[PDB]
Amino acid sequence: PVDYHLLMMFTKAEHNAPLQAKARVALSSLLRLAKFEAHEVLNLHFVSEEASREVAKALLRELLFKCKVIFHDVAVLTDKLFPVVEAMQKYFSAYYSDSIFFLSVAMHQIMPKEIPRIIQLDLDLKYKTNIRELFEEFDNFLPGAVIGIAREMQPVYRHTFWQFRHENPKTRVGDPPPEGLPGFNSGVMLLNLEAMRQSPLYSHLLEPSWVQQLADKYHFRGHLGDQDFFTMIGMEHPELFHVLDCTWNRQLCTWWRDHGYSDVFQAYFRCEGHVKIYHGNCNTPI
Ligand SMILES: [Mn+2]
Questions:
Q1: Where does 62-192 have alpha helices with state H?
Q2: Does 73 count as an annotated binding residue?
């Protein structure tokens, strides 16, 4: 038997209508289009407090190869995360309870060695293809690449990295694809836990003095959590990241097009190809 691990954040879902409506679109399309071989099993990890754990379990009964549904206690993971992720919530969430928004950063240390690879996924997603096909992207990783991630399709990191770009007008940091580095979107993340444990460079980038060192270089104080950490790391060391094709995460949010970046927005938003996963980020319908 071969295991395939998926992780989803499912917090504060109790009496939350828009979140439950999102999860219905996400989990339905995921399971309706999923097709695995008889010998292999799909594992669905959810991190939820006692309240939302009920909401999830009740929703999966309507929708359910073997597929094990695992539930992770929010507090247990938060308590485990905090001593490892404290030095970077003052930089990427510029207090204790908000350590769970950095789960992806230290997924390898939180998850058991029994699990080699996991895909963290948002709930504002729609799945247009089979999810087993995404796992194939792990094979396209270079040795020394730890994370699989799609690029950010909004000029978010123009404004975020403003001061660095003001000092380095030639830089690619914040520039649109393909020549520039637009940053990453954390909606769909292929986390190679095995590679994350084995990489000395990644092990050191998680250390306090290293986070500080690099954040000060870019004058970085963000608000996007784990996404900001990966994005900043991807500026110094882009070779740690296997950049997914945009079709794996076509983000639909057009906010910045109407709030400051009308001119350059398209260079970031552009994505030609048959969509495999839609990400209705910022409450955008699909
Ligand atoms: Mn999202």
A1: 74-85, 107-110, 132-135, 156-160, 162-167
A2: no
Distance separating alpha carbons of residues 202 and 146, to the nearest angstrom: 8
**Rounded Cα gap, residues 200 and 191, in angstroms:** 16
Tell me, in angstroms, the distance from the centre of ligand 1 to residue 253's CA. Answer: 10
- Report how far residue 64's alpha carbon sits from residue 262's, in angstroms, rounded to the nearest whole number: 43
How close is the Cα of 234 to the center of ligand 1, in Å?
20
CA gap 18, 21 in Å, rounded:
5
CB atoms under 10 Å from CB of 130, counted, come to 15
* 186 annotated to bind ligand: yes
The C-alpha angle 120, 198, 10, rounded to 5 degrees, equals 15
Closest CA to 8 of 95, 71, 97: 71
Span from the CA of 111 to the centroid of ligand 1 (angstroms): 22
248 is in an annotated binding site: no
